């Protein structure tokens, strides 16, 4: 008669690493590292991102004529951008503080687009109908749908002076531009003034632009350029616009309800809803593990990215049956 004292063993080839030994089989194991995404751009908490499609941030925000389908996309969880957007800044030029604007917009949860200086009544002394071949829309000449190119009327170019008080109770983003013609002949033909200026001020903001005449390399068939500038108004502040030529007017502006936790993702993955509390450019992560090896740049409630193939722990016994 006898008693033997021992332990169980089973059919398992999972192994763990140790400090003294590299290949230990176990009877039970857990894995702390997540290595798989579902391939889809899911909605964090069920709220969709702004999908830019083929347009850039400077395309969407300016009203680039061809990214029209997104002008109604008020509620944002994050931004999804194509790796190589083509639609934006249709009239070539420099967009000032673009990276900073991108960051400020990324955190906005709600965009109320509104007319700030309405086209029909704000400029009775100027042409508000100028359009370009570069900002083509369905084959027809057009322009950004948040901006107005103001040129002379009846041989005159009366001075522009108007202002807006921020009564939106949100920060207001006002975008405008400055035209830099390729030739003094266009400067006169369009604005009737050889020495134009553009001046924009607020209680604390102050910038003067001095349009330059120069032939630049031709881009999208333009020899000149329109630079874009912007600033935000705090509630109660005022933006004052003054010019004697070359102002591309701030027809539309955005009242921004600021949030946090959002950001911008560059991805060519399709959208398909799941509650992806964590999301990478490659798709959703849906797990509770402390680490991931899926992607270093993530958004949402994510496992920490680690450069490791496996983080397996042993919970069971060393698996050696006899």
């Amino acid at each position: 008669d006898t008693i033997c004292i021992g332990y169980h063993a089973n059919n398992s080839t999972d192994t763990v690493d140790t400090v003294l030994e590299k290949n230990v089989t176990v009877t039970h194991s857990v894995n702390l590292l997540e290595d798989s995404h579902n391939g889809k751009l899911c909605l964090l908490k069920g709220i969709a991102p702004l999908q830019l499609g083929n347009c850039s941030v400077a395309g969407w925000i300016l009203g680039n004529p061809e990214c029209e389908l997104l002008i109604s996309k008020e509620s944002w969880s994050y931004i999804v951008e194509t790796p190589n957007p083509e639609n934006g800044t249709c009239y070539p030029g420099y967009f000032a503080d673009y990276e900073e604007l991108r960051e400020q917009l990324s955190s906005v949860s709600s965009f109320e687009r509104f007319e700030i200086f309405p086209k029909e009544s704000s400029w009775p002394n100027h042409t508000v109908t100028g359009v370009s071949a570069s900002c083509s829309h369905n084959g027809k000449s057009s322009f950004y749908r948040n901006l107005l190119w103001l040129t002379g009327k009846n041989g005159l170019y009366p001075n522009l002076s108007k202002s807006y008080v921020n009564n939106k109770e949100k920060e207001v983003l006002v975008l405008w531009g400055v035209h830099h013609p390729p030739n003094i002949g266009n400067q006169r033909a369009l604005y009737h003034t050889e020495n134009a200026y553009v001046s924009v001020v607020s209680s604390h903001y102050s910038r003067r632009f001095t349009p330059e005449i120069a032939k630049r390399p031709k881009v999208r068939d333009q020899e000149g350029r329109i630079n874009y500038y912007w600033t935000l108004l705090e509630p109660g502040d005022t933006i004052i616009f003054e010019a004697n030529g070359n102002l591309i007017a701030p027809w539309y502006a955005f009242a921004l309800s600021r949030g946090f936790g959002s950001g911008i993702i560059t991805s060519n993955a399709p959208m398909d809803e799941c509650d992806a509390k964590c999301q990478t450019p490659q798709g959703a992560i849906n797990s509770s593990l402390p680490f991931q090896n899926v992607h270093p740049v993530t958004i949402g409630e994510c496992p920490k990215y680690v450069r490791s193939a496996k983080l397996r722990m042993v919970t069971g016994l060393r698996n050696i049956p006899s």
Partner: antibody
Framework: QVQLQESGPGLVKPSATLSLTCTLS????????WSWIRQPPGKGLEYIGN???????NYNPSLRSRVTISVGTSKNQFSLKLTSVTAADTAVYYC????????????????????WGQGTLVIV | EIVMTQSPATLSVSPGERATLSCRAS??????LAWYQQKPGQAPRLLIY???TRATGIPARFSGSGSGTDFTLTISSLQSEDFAVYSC?????????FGQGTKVE
């Protein structure tokens, strides 16, 4: 390349409004400003005014109280209307397109006209 | 309107030789002047805009220059189809206007 043709009454009495329509053949209004020009026999041309299809108009102030210019919904037609004809209006009316500013820019003025019709003579 | 007139109300040129016309404005029009041809039963045709630049399709035979109030209109040679009524347009003011026109025969 766009070509224009005027059509309407060749006779308008002083108590009546003169209404002439221009049809655009081989084209459409296309973001350009379109004009009416007048020429009484024995005289040079007189500028009446223009219109952009968007509803933007510019008139010679001397005729402002009597002239309106409008566009149709076919967007290949537009028309001139002169009220209270005074018989000083016994002139040839011409349809013309304002010249394009540039190959890559329109919707702005150039100050002169590039295609013209032959014009129609109206007797009062 | 800026009243503008043409002194050579009519020209008479038998050979296909050079002919000139002129326009004089009561007020400066800078370089904002256009020069047109007109024939009875024909559509008017633009020759020159901006005082000196030819319109597309216009022969090298038509040229001109000027500024302010004084403009010179040159036809290098008259072909039989160029014995047209000619006129200038001033677009440096509002309303825009035209001269009385001249007849070339």
């Amino acid at each position: 390349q766009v070509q224009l043709q005027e059509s309407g009454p060749g006779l308008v009495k002083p108590s009546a409004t003169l209404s002439l329509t221009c049809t655009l053949s081989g084209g459409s209004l296309s973001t350009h400003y379109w004009s009416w020009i007048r020429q009484p026999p024995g005289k040079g041309l007189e500028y009446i005014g223009n219109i952009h299809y968007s509803g933007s108009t510019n008139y010679n102030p001397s005729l402002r109280s009597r002239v309106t210019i409008s566009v149709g919904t076919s967007k290949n037609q537009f028309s001139l209307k002169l009220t209270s004809v005074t018989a000083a209006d016994t002139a040839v009316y011409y349809c013309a397109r304002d010249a394009p500013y540039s190959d890559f820019l329109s919707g702005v003025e150039t100050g002169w006209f590039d295609p013209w019709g032959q014009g129609t003579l109206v007797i009062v | 309107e800026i009243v503008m007139t043409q002194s050579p109300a009519t020209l008479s040129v038998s050979p296909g030789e050079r002919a000139t016309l002129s326009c004089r404005a009561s007020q400066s029009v800078s370089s904002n002047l256009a020069w047109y041809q007109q024939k009875p039963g024909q559509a008017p045709r633009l020759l020159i805009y901006g005082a000196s630049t030819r319109a597309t399709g216009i022969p090298a035979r038509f040229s001109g220059s000027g500024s302010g109030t004084d403009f010179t209109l040159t036809i290098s040679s008259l072909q039989s189809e160029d014995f047209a009524v000619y006129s200038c347009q001033q677009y440096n003011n509002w309303p825009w206007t035209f001269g009385q026109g001249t007849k070339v025969e």
